[PDB]
Amino acid sequence: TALVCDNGSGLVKAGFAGDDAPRAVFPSIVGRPRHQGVMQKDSYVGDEAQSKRGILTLKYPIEHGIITNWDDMEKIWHHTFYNELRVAPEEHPTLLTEAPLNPKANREKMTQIMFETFNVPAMYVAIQAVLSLYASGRTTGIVLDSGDGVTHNVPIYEGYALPHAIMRLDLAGRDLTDYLMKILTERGYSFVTTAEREIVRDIKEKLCYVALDFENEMATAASSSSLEKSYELPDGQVITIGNERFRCPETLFQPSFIGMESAGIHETTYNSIMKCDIDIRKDLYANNVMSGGTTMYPGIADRMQKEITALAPSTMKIKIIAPPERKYSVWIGGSILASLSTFQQMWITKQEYDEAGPSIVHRKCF
Amino acid sequence: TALVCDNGSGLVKAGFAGDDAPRAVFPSIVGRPRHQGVMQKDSYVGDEAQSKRGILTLKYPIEHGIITNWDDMEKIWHHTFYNELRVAPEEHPTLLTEAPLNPKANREKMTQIMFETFNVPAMYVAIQAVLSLYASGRTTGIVLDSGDGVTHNVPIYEGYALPHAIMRLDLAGRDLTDYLMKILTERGYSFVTTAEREIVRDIKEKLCYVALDFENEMATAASSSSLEKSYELPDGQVITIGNERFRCPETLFQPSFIGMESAGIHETTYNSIMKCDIDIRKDLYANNVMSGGTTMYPGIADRMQKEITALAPSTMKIKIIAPPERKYSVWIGGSILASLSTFQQMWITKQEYDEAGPSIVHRKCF
Amino acid sequence: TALVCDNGSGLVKAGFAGDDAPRAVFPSIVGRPRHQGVMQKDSYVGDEAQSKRGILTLKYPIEHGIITNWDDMEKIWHHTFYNELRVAPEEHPTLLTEAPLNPKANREKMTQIMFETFNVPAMYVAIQAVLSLYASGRTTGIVLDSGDGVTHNVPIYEGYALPHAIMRLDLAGRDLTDYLMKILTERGYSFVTTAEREIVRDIKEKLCYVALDFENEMATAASSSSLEKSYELPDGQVITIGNERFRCPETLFQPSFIGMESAGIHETTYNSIMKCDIDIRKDLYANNVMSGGTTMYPGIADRMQKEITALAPSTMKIKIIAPPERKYSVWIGGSILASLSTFQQMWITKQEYDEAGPSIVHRKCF
Amino acid sequence: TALVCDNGSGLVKAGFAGDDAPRAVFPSIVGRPRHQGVMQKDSYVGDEAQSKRGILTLKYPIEHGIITNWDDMEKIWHHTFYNELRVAPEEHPTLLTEAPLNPKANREKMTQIMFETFNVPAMYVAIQAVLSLYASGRTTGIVLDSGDGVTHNVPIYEGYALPHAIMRLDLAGRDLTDYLMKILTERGYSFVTTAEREIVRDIKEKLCYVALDFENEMATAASSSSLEKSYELPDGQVITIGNERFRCPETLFQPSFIGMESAGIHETTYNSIMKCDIDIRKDLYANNVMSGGTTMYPGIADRMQKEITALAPSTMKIKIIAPPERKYSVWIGGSILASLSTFQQMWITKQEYDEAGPSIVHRKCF
Amino acid sequence: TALVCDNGSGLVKAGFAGDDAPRAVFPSIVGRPRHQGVMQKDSYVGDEAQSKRGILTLKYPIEHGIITNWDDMEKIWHHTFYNELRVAPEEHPTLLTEAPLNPKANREKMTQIMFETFNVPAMYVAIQAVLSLYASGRTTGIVLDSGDGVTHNVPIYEGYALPHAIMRLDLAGRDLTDYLMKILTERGYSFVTTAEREIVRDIKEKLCYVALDFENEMATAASSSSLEKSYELPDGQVITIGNERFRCPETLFQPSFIGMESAGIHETTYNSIMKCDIDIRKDLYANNVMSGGTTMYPGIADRMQKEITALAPSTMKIKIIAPPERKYSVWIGGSILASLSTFQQMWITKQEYDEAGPSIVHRKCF
Ligand SMILES: Nc1ncnc2c1ncn2[C@@H]1O[C@H](COP(=O)(O)OP(=O)(O)O)[C@@H](O)[C@H]1O
Ligand SMILES: Nc1ncnc2c1ncn2[C@@H]1O[C@H](COP(=O)(O)OP(=O)(O)O)[C@@H](O)[C@H]1O
Ligand SMILES: Nc1ncnc2c1ncn2[C@@H]1O[C@H](COP(=O)(O)OP(=O)(O)O)[C@@H](O)[C@H]1O
Ligand SMILES: Nc1ncnc2c1ncn2[C@@H]1O[C@H](COP(=O)(O)OP(=O)(O)O)[C@@H](O)[C@H]1O
Ligand SMILES: Nc1ncnc2c1ncn2[C@@H]1O[C@H](COP(=O)(O)OP(=O)(O)O)[C@@H](O)[C@H]1O
Ligand code: BEF
Ligand code: BEF
Ligand code: BEF
Ligand code: BEF
Ligand code: BEF
Ligand SMILES: [Mg+2]
Ligand SMILES: [Mg+2]
Ligand SMILES: [Mg+2]
Ligand SMILES: [Mg+2]
Ligand SMILES: [Mg+2]
């Protein structure tokens, strides 16, 4: 059986091809002690680093889909194979994922590590948005995947990708967390350390939602208090947040909140459709597929429906497809792809890698 | 029973001899993917290529009645026999059509393919304008056939053709479509790709008409807006066109609009009549038969009537015969001819082709 | 004296008729602050917007030769007359330029602004490729003008234009800049904002060249490092690019690199010649005139020479005329035309415009 | 004339707009007797509390730029207006200051007290780092202000602020004083009470300096005794300190000395520049403006110059601007701003406050 | 086997590593005759000085954890090795203890005496609060150790110490004894000499307790006499004390009783927890470990539980761990540490001390 590992900027999703859900889902963090030991491990990975985060400095080795710390990324892969899956890497072909429009050296160095450090028999690097379309059981649609580091649009029609219409935005979940940390100081709550950033991320996942009409929601939160909710910190302190609940996800539709010049995810989706041939736009309008953890905000599908309907012609039928399991769509699609009998010819074996060099990994890639 | 296949520059009309209408009518196009497949057929033909045209490059293998791409033309014949008619070619004699004054190698290579690739028992290549006269139930008349690639005049008197009065013009429907694409840029509408050319062709067939008086119509369209009509694009966008509706078909009467030096179809018809013997001109004036898709514009028979009346003597009775089914006149006439008991001696059998070479196909031909 | 203003998609070229070079050459941009002022002008134009681009959102009011933002285009004309030329518009007749096959409303609204906002005494809108032939001192030749927004071919023979052989391609310098931004992400360089697009444009103008043989050049850049060059960013960072230097201009000859279906500039030039009368093709083959900033790549004349020689008959003499000042050929030709005594009758005066309406501006136009 | 009051965490700087220096500079402390009176005022403020600190418990009402004790903060404002300036608050508009990223209720409650307790005619709360740029006579630069409670970086370019690049660190002078108290116990000196903390603060301001190379300085202080200096306590005891002189200010560059996870002021300045647009970084590198009392250590400008030069590209010109009067830069800039004729429209009058509520005070604020 | 010597300000605890209790526990006093001998030893140490205290002046060589009289401290170490343990110092490695935040010269001079006067083979100076956590069998908790001279809080999480949250208070048992001597004069009991201070210390250890509610206890002692207890002096006189029983230990929670400005041990514990990372506070709240003789008052754990519960959030579980043997926790923990096989590498041998100087003793120290 094959291994399917979706190495996100925020979460590692790993498991075996053929399963319906990832077996191991843990944060993609490496923690190191920042104080002084007197009574000890040198570094902690994943959920272990999360439970000891009070005395650790937490580091993400992947920033915006790009692996920045290769020594820490190797610890995460080692932790995934031996501690989470309890499997031998040299026995299973490994399907990895990557964001589109990544640097070419990122995929080449990832292939060298899988072949020379873990000695996998074969491997393959897929494009994440293509796997998301496999998970939804579709051959046509424009995928909006938004994770912790990358937001990208990839239109696909009848199984053919349109690489020249691919959009990529370096605004995702981690940028929303940093923005929530900033606007929480308006109420006197100060989250500074990397461990406290994990607390704000948990606040974001529990209380934040997307307002259908932002300016109408801002007036409601300013008049009454029915939108305010409480949250208990790990030390028992209770904080209360009001309009911060929908101001944080609003950055997805107004990236100028964090000083970015780019357009929101609704305009980016519409611009990607308008770059496609006029004869496929009707099918793309009816098959907007959302995937990734950042699409899990309550009300984001209704907001995307409203914003794209206002941009598209009135006779087009806009349909946002947001299944409940879309947070793992990339992994689920990779599990379906790695189980296809037609796919078994696309594995890049160790023998082919020794005779073709690193350039063999850049095929069917964009 | 015999097969009747009218392979036009734009449409394939195929069916069985004895029927009243073609069984299979589909565009004579071959489409190939122009992007990149990630999730597939290599090429699509006819209506299948039309429905997937958003991700295809569309190619017409026939240009101006002349087969240019023989590999693609073979795919269209294969698609016609096995996908559209669901018939075995080696069981039916096949009546094919051709425009007059075509290159001799076009008919010879078409005969070699029918005998050696499809192994038809017998075949025959008829002249299209002669079949149009069969469809109208006439033995005398001058036929003006205008399709997608060729416009030609053929006078026939009491069953005798006058080959030396045959006119041929390489201005037809596809040239009007390209001209409509050009003058639509005046309103800011940009159709460039081969898939968008199919959209303009649909605009032409829905909204374009022939003005009875062109300069009087240009003044009306410049003064008011009663001639403007809207059209909804496949993606929901609505375009509005005014004088482009009658400027496009006006090219048939003023070929200088597209830079051609030739005379319009009315002058070409009159010149063909004036090259005929003076004793048959009265019968030709009263039997102007129009056929083909490009004669389907509203008001073209009234315009032809007016233009030829102004050229002919005042005592001649000009009569334009334009039946409602004239878009399939060539096929209907070929269905009548292939069902005649007198015609059964004109079949070129496979045995006669092996003993006489390709030169046997050039009999009763011009 | 007359004003000659070449309003390109990328650069404004303005000056006085009779001069040898434009007096004012500045980018056709309008910048507006995108942050928040605390210590201010509302908008900046041209070189002023270029020097402050770090805190501005830069907007081009002309896209593909078509004016899209008329309020911003009016700011550019105002900046041209009063800040760059320091002249009174109501004292000089103004010769403007336009790309062929533009929407008719573009030229009409441009005439209304010049007569009612700036109150010019007279004006005239010339066709750019015709002016390029004036600059080269020729009466016969096929002009390939490629600027920031439009690439077009216009054949002219003995002073007569052939409008039905005019080609227009919406692929020019700005599309090459966007493609260079895309393929620079392969090396981990991320240019996203409109200000960073100006940096990539500067990279393109300094380092990009046209390879004589593309596939042979790709093998050289993949084997060694002699083609790699460094470039210092405004903040002191040094980037290094290799095959991106010739992959970006290769899009001119292979528009499928950016997903366009059209043919390259060499095939478009050859197709335009083949649409012309056979008796003028020999003179067009020997007078290929290149103009515009996008024809300034090193090696593009040698590549065009090689590609057209491979398409034309072996006995034809292909000659590419590429003078060193061809980046301003449209302006230089407009300066020659506006100084001709024969041209002084073609000025459209304010009095003629009030009595003939906007339709007077569509004369000698295509 | 207007009042300019810079209420710092450590010092109150108050005076009149138009002057060159604050008229009243006193510690922002409230002292209350902690023993028992037998022979009396209930509380002492400022320099009076400083001279009687032996029998007082000293309290700072402002912690890390945030007013914590509003009853004590009201005593300080009352002491400022009536005892230090000898002025009537209801006759002068008052310009107050605040650190960026403060809680919103801090500025709202400060406005309510100025309007309802002191009945000022108008008021305005400025951002401190913006005023520091006014004092230096610049429109572009990144300000590093470090006082007693807050250290913050604010980049400004051509008069436009970049709020999304603003850094704030809760490490300043009071944290260095507490760290000096801790490391003085290594030599057997025990400072515990709030009155003795004022003695350590005086030691810090007299003897502490920033080492150019910390590890090289630690080796010199460990080998000889040329770095040791003596200090006479208020009771005549003489203490001698060696490497504590530069270990205390080193916390600014290594916040891990006091257990903070954040980066030093040099890395924070460089990170703030790298978050800004690439086109403004060159101007920010050349205009590093330092302000506040914590930037008054000898050798801190040379150390900042060295640390940022090691982080920035080698071709950038790093220039630290540290004027001798930078300890009062916020007040001096507020004195310049309150004297501008353009600023007289930004006063928030008492009438506007009664009709717009407390929300009017959050304009041009971050 | 190793020697474990806990040299407190009040008691010497000495024994061998591996044992469960100290073998020698005696007061850390040196007594010298203060009258005139007529019928004799020059000085007495420990229990011998205690039994002859009537004719001696008693001196403590350690004040507030700091060795003040080095000649007398050497007599105590000599008495410990040769009279109490009857052991040869040059045969056993010696584990010594020290309070945190002590002067550096205290530990250096103690190391020089152990190596040059007693010629121990190896030695090590541990931090007392860390040893207290070893004794309780915990890896996480905040230790409140209160002896005769020093009270300090040290939080430890999962074996990692947080030195920047360490509190130290120079208020312990000897200050409570001096306060009891003062308030006993209210009943006419006069204890003045150093020998009578030992009697008051015995009164404190027998009769003093911590009141759960101080003001409610003061009302009970003022209304009735059920809280009064008698104590027989060495000469047969019987004294009776009432509210002095709980007023003396109340100084631990209200240090202002003896004129100290610091906060009580409950506020100091809570402040130390609040300086720690928010993610470890829940574990520190549940693991408050008390050690030392001054934590042996009846009712001090219930009072600490009540005071910290009133400061902490209501959802936190406050748990005070006070084992019955906590008066020797530092020694018991040092006996466990010196018996660990992992610790045998941390011994500072005499050879390492001769080659590294006194600076080797400051490792893993704060
Ligand atoms: N219920 C939720 N609501 C909002 N955001 C969520 C939710 N669950 C997860 N996220 C966000 O999704 C991001 C990561 O999701 P994922 O798609 O796994 O990203 P990646 O694949 O890049 O690691 C995190 O930043 C997290 O904050
Ligand atoms: N209703 C219509 N009005 C105008 N043109 C039409 C109409 N229907 C078909 N056509 C044109 O007729 C042309 C093809 O007709 P046809 O006679 O089948 O040509 P061919 O036989 O050469 O394929 C096409 O170019 C199409 O645009
Ligand atoms: N040396 C050069 N090499 C390549 N491209 C260039 C060079 N100089 C200018 N260009 C390109 O030419 C384009 C604009 O030239 P121009 O002919 O003025 O266009 P327009 O007239 O449409 O404004 C710009 O996109 C610019 O990038
Ligand atoms: N010469 C000096 N050297 C070092 N630190 C100084 C000096 N003078 C003042 N300080 C420190 O500056 C801090 C306060 O300066 P200031 O900028 O007024 O802060 P705030 O505005 O927050 O009150 C105090 O903590 C003080 O210790
Ligand atoms: N039962 C008790 N109740 C109250 N205090 C006690 C009791 N037993 C001992 N003490 C006090 O504990 C102090 C010394 O204990 P210890 O922890 O050994 O201190 P050190 O280690 O500093 O010598 C003495 O001041 C003594 O008065
Ligand atoms: F890396 Be995640 F998918 F943004
Ligand atoms: F080929 Be069609 F009949 F013009
Ligand atoms: F507008 Be440029 F001439 F392409
Ligand atoms: F409050 Be100070 F300016 F740090
Ligand atoms: F010296 Be004791 F432990 F207070
Ligand atoms: Mg992902
Ligand atoms: Mg036909
Ligand atoms: Mg141009
Ligand atoms: Mg300040
Ligand atoms: Mg002790």
Numbering used by the authors:
A (entry chain C), B (entry chain E), C (entry chain D), D (entry chain B), E (entry chain A): 6 to 44, 49 to 375
Quote the study on this structure.
Many processes driven by actin, such as cell division, depend on its ATPase activity. Here we present 6 cryo-electron microscopy (cryo-EM) structures of rabbit skeletal α-actin filaments at approximately 2.2 Å resolution in 3 functional states, polymerized in the presence of Mg2+ or Ca2+. After the exit of Pi, ADP-bound F-actin represents the ‘aged’ state of the filament, which can then be depolymerized back to G-actin. By contrast, our structures are remarkably similar in all solved nucleotide states, showing that ADP-F-actin should not be regarded as destabilized but rather as a ‘primed state’, which exhibits faster depolymerization rates at the filament ends and is sensitive to cofilin binding and severing due to the absence of the γ-phosphate moiety.
We solved F-actin structures using ADP complexed with beryllium fluoride (BeF3−, also referred to as BeFx)29 to mimic the short-lived ATP state of the filament. In the Mg2+-ADP-BeF3− F-actin structure (2.17 Å), we observed unambiguous density for the modelling of ADP-BeF3− in the nucleotide-binding site. Notably, the nucleotide conformation of Mg2+-ADP-BeF3− in F-actin resembled Mg2+-ATP in G-actin, confirming the suitability of ADP-BeF3− as ATP mimic. In Mg2+-ADP-BeF3− F-actin, Mg2+ is coordinated by Pβ of ADP, a fluoride moiety of BeF3− and four water molecules, defining a hexa-coordinated, octahedral coordination, similar to that of Mg2+ in ATP-G-actin. As no other ordered water molecules align in front of the nucleotide, the water molecule that is hydrogen-bonded to Q137 is likely to represent the nucleophile (Wnuc) that hydrolyses ATP in F-actin. The O–Be–Wnuc angle in the structure is 144°, whereas an angle of >150° is required for efficient nucleophilic attack. Although it cannot be excluded that nucleotide orientation is slightly altered between ADP-BeF3−-bound and ATP-bound F-actin, inspection of the reconstruction showed that the density for Wnuc is extended, indicating that the position of Wnuc is not fixed, allowing it to move into a position that brings the O–Be–Wnuc angle >150° while remaining hydrogen-bonded to Q137. In the Mg2+-ADP-BeF3− F-actin structure, we could separate two intrastrand conformations through a focused classification approach. The first conformation (about 37% of the particles, 2.32 Å resolution) represents the open D-loop, where the D-loop bends outwardly and interacts with the extended C terminus of the adjacent actin subunit. In the second conformation (about 63% of the particles, 2.32 Å resolution), the C terminus remains extended but turns away from the inwardly folded, closed D-loop.
